Amino acid sequence: ESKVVVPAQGKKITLQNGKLNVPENPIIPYIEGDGIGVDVTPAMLKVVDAAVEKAYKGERKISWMEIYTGEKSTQVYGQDVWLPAETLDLIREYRVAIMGPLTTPVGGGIRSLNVALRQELDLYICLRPVRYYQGTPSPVKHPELTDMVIFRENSEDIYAGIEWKADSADAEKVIKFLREEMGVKKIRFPEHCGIGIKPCSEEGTKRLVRAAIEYAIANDRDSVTLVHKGNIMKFTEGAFKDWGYQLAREEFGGELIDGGPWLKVKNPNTGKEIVIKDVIADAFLQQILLRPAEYDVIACMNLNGDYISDALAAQVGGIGIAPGANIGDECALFEATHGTAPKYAGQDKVNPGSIILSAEMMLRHMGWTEAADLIVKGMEGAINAKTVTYDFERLMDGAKLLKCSEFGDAIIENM
Amino acid sequence: ESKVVVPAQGKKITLQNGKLNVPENPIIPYIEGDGIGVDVTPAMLKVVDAAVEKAYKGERKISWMEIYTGEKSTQVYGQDVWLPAETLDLIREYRVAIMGPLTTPVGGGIRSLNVALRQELDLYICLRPVRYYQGTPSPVKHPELTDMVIFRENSEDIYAGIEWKADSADAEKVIKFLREEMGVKKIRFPEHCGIGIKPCSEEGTKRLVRAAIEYAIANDRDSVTLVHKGNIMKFTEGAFKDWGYQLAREEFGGELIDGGPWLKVKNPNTGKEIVIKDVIADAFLQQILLRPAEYDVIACMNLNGDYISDALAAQVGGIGIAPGANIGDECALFEATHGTAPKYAGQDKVNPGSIILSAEMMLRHMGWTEAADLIVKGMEGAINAKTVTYDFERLMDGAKLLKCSEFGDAIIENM
Numbered sequence: 001e002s003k004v005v006v007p008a009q010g011k012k013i014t015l016q017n018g019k020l021n022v023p024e025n026p027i028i029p030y031i032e033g034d035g036i037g038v039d040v041t042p043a044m045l046k047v048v049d050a051a052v053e054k055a056y057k058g059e060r061k062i063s064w065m066e067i068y069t070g071e072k073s074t075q076v077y078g079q080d081v082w083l084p085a086e087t088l089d090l091i092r093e094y095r096v097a098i099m100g101p102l103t104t105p106v107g108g109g110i111r112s113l114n115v116a117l118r119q120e121l122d123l124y125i126c127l128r129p130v131r132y133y134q135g136t137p138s139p140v141k142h143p144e145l146t147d148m149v150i151f152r153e154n155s156e157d158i159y160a161g162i163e164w165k166a167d168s169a170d171a172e173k174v175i176k177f178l179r180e181e182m183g184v185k186k187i188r189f190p191e192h193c194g195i196g197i198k199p200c201s202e203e204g205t206k207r208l209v210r211a212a213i214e215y216a217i218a219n220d221r222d223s224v225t226l227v228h229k230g231n232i233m234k235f236t237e238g239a240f241k242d243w244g245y246q247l248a249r250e251e252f253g254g255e256l257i258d259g260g261p262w263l264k265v266k267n268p269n270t271g272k273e274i275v276i277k278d279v280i281a282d283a284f285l286q287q288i289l290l291r292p293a294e295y296d297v298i299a300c301m302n303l304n305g306d307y308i309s310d311a312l313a314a315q316v317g318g319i320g321i322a323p324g325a326n327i328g329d330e331c332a333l334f335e336a337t338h339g340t341a342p343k344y345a346g347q348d349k350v351n352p353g354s355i356i357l358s359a360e361m362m363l364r365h366m367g368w369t370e371a372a373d374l375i376v377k378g379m380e381g382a383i384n385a386k387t388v389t390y391d392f393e394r395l396m397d398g399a400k401l402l403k404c405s406e407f408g409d410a411i412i413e414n415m
Numbered sequence: 416e417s418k419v420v421v422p423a424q425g426k427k428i429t430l431q432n433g434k435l436n437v438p439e440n441p442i443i444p445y446i447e448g449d450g451i452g453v454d455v456t457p458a459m460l461k462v463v464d465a466a467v468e469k470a471y472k473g474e475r476k477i478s479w480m481e482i483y484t485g486e487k488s489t490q491v492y493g494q495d496v497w498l499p500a501e502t503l504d505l506i507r508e509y510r511v512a513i514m515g516p517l518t519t520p521v522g523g524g525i526r527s528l529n530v531a532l533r534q535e536l537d538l539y540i541c542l543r544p545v546r547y548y549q550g551t552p553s554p555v556k557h558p559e560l561t562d563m564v565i566f567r568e569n570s571e572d573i574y575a576g577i578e579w580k581a582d583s584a585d586a587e588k589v590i591k592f593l594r595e596e597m598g599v600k601k602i603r604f605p606e607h608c609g610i611g612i613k614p615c616s617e618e619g620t621k622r623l624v625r626a627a628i629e630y631a632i633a634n635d636r637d638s639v640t641l642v643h644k645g646n647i648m649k650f651t652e653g654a655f656k657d658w659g660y661q662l663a664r665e666e667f668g669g670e671l672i673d674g675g676p677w678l679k680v681k682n683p684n685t686g687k688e689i690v691i692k693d694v695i696a697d698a699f700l701q702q703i704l705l706r707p708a709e710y711d712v713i714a715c716m717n718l719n720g721d722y723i724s725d726a727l728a729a730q731v732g733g734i735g736i737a738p739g740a741n742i743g744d745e746c747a748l749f750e751a752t753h754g755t756a757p758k759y760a761g762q763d764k765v766n767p768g769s770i771i772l773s774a775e776m777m778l779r780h781m782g783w784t785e786a787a788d789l790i791v792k793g794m795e796g797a798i799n800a801k802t803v804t805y806d807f808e809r810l811m812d813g814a815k816l817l818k819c820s821e822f823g824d825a826i827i828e829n830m
């Protein structure tokens with residue numbers, strides 16, 4: 001028995017040959033989110049409606065439709081309903097959706113609801129753009145040199161949750177198989193030993209890298225860097241790097257730069273040379289601090305992407321305003337990237353920036369670039385104005401302290 | 416037929432009940448290192464001899480004994496000799512050794528010689544202290560707030576090199592076993608798929624965490640933070656966190672702080688309260704930038720430790736001067752932590768700081784704290800004096816440019 005209400009006014013977005021067809025009255029499912037979701041989601045709804053209204057002078061309007069996942073889903077659908085089947089069906093059916101932060105419970109053997117959503121809908125691209133907003137307090141000297149776009153592989157890697165607990169019958173069984181059937185000698189302590197599996201496939205790697213390159217082409221970016229720990233994990237991380245370079249050669253006319261290993265790919269629209277290169281992951285966490293300007297589009301595996309995105313967000317003072325998308329071939333789910341921060345929930349206190357900027361990515365994904373531009377513009381103005389939420393204000397002098405909802409208004413005020 | 420020459424003057428260090436017995440004329444094996452090893456090692460030898468000579472007025476002297484691993488080993492012992500058996504025997508026999516950077520060849524199925532050395536000698540602690548040297552050009556505003564000591568688990572994790580290449584008969588076999596015998600459903604693309612294994616054991620985790628806590632006690636440090644990605648990898652990363660906390664409760668009288676989950680451990684020598692806490696790895700890469708002062712001793716798994724150490728080193732401007740040790744129960748191997756940088760090899764140009772500070776850790780490990788203190792003092796003086804190698808100088812105004820060997824002298828000059 002669904003508790004979802006389809007808006008009476010409103011039409012579903014359609015997908016016609018890899019191309020979204022967005023009506024002027026699209027229905028957008030949204031998940032409020034747990035904890036501070038109660039604060040940031042309404043700020044996002046208001047800010048989005050304003051930008052859309054201003055951009056198209058009332059010709060277009062989103063019909064928001066609440067759907068459920070997480071703690072609130074249990075309150076709505078009952079006890080063990082953390083992720084209702086219909087939520088998966090609805091996101092797929094309506095093609096574009098957005099969500100606040102989710103609470104995954106502990107003690108019940110439930111795995112990350114965020115990851116569940118990504119894997120279940122096969123949203124194989126985790127897209128995390130990272131730029132600096134002038135006026136943001138940052139811990140680094142030159143945050144303005146950071147302008148990157150992370151394509152993080154979302155469907156494979158150790159992140160896929162294949163593992164067995166130490167001393168479990170399964171763990172014992174897997175370890176037996178490995179030592180006796182596979183002749184594995186390098187397990188240091190085979191007893192009381194947990195075991196995880198890290199898969200990385202040619203198809204998985206290539207759909208991710210294909211998207212990263214298409215994005216560099218579509219947006220006239222300077223380069224795509226394959227980031228990997230291939231010198232230690234040759235057949236997963238190293239294979240990802242090799243497949244990445246290969247895809248570039250096979251589908252995009254990638255050709256050797258000097259002695260290699262870097263390649264150049266010609267932008268078929270602008271004729272610009274896009275550099276395809278690679279950096280070992282540990283060095284890369286150094287290079288983003290020391291030479292951020294040399295990096296643009298990044299393509300990498302699941303776990304590394306997680307680390308890199310977070311490291312970048314912190315460096316530009318954007319820990320609380322980092323936008324993110326999960327994109328597959330059939331639908332897309334945009335998200336607040338921070339946690340539920342239950343301590344502040346309901347206080348109208350936290351920064352709605354992250355979910356607002358994810359909504360910006362959503363609008364842009366929908367082809368409503370004018371409205372998306374107004375959000376970027378509003379965000380830039382409000383931050384420049386030093387009219388900000390506590391998390392920014394406490395790090396600045398002469399800022400005006402705004403509530404969550406008030407920061408929403410300040411964004412609108414600057415549109 | 417050994418090509419190693421045991422020094423005529425000199426005595427071997429001994430181990431008596433977990434306690435090193437160091438004679439006044441200890442023999443120390445050293446591996447020159449490939450590439451810039453030719454530049455930094457002699458700078459290290461000279462700087463160490465000076466500190467030892469000054470500290471003990473000639474009463475003590477190290478008898479350096481060259482041993483081999485890497486490219487130079489092939490030149491010495493022949494074609495496929497990258498890591499001679501005797502090198503393992505010698506390091507174990509002489510208890511304390513140091514090395515420059517190593518070249519692991521590509522194309523021959525040889526795995527990291529660094530990792531080989533660590534695993535083969537069971538040097539299960541990778542010890543990476545990270546502090547700021549006043550005067551070092553850093554990309555962050557307040558590098559002086561960083562004063563941490565990383566205990567990185569060295570013997571397990573995905574870093575152990577257990578994996579099979581996509582399309583290999585073994586890969587196919589492992590994937591078959593997993594899908595059909597283990598009922599694994601979450602491998603997205605089972606074809607053309609590489610597979611790695613990530614082990615984490617109770618014993619492996621606890622010997623690492625035990626060392627981290629003993630170190631916090633011995634050095635009156637404020638806290639030990641377990642860093643892990645346990646919310647996604649429950650049975651490896653999560654188990655490491657749980658075992659860590661458990662070890663603290665079982666062996667060190669760890670007790671709940673407030674509602675937990677943090678614990679307090681009483682320093683049995685100073686009565687100081689040592690906090691045992693934990694942070695998810697992705698957040699931790701943010702927290703080291705945003706709140707570096709809240710962190711002290713870190714305990715974490717192999718791969719995470721790799722990332723964290725490198726990220727920290729970059730933030731304090733120490734990418735080229737980061738010291739490191741590999742420590743086991745029977746011996747210890749100190750190392751330059753940077754690469755071989757072949758482009759500058761032999762130019763007497765690069766920064767010998769990393770290997771010099773690893774030598775500082777070696778001297779301290781040997782109980783020769785007075786000599787170790789003189790190196791710290793020299794390094795602080797030379798850097799403060801702005802008398803530095805190109806890698807520092809190019810980032811500063813009004814520095815004096817020194818060659819590698821000259822920077823060695825500047826350190827001595829400041830002792």
Ligand SMILES: Nc1ncnc2c1ncn2[C@@H]1O[C@H](COP(=O)(O)O)[C@@H](O)[C@H]1OP(=O)(O)O
Nearest residue numbers: 320321338339340341342350351352353354391
């Ligand atoms: N949008 C936001 N605006 C301001 N602070 C945030 C935001 N999101 C997260 N935080 C901070 O990060 C944490 C994220 O919550 P959690 O990781 O427990 O789910 C919160 O405790 C809060 O930390 P703080 O106590 O420093 O203000």
Ligand SMILES: Nc1ncnc2c1ncn2[C@@H]1O[C@H](COP(=O)(O)O)[C@@H](O)[C@H]1OP(=O)(O)O
Nearest residue numbers: 735736753754755756757765766767768769806
């Ligand atoms: N001790 C050092 N002093 C100065 N620069 C170093 C040092 N170690 C490494 N580097 C730099 O880091 C790289 C490490 O070498 P590799 O990772 O290829 O093995 C070198 O190319 C050099 O980069 P750079 O060209 O910026 O001067």
Ligand SMILES: O=C(O)CCC(=O)C(=O)O
Nearest residue numbers: 112113114115306646647
């Ligand atoms: O999603 C989770 O629940 C943990 C991993 C994470 O933060 C992410 O994947 O972005």
Ligand SMILES: O=C(O)CCC(=O)C(=O)O
Nearest residue numbers: 231232527528529530721
């Ligand atoms: O050791 C290697 O060869 C690569 C990994 C690394 O740099 C390290 O483990 O410190």
Ligand SMILES: [Ca+2]
Nearest residue numbers: 306310697698
């Ligand atoms: Ca994250």
Ligand SMILES: [Ca+2]
Nearest residue numbers: 282283721725
């Ligand atoms: Ca490293």
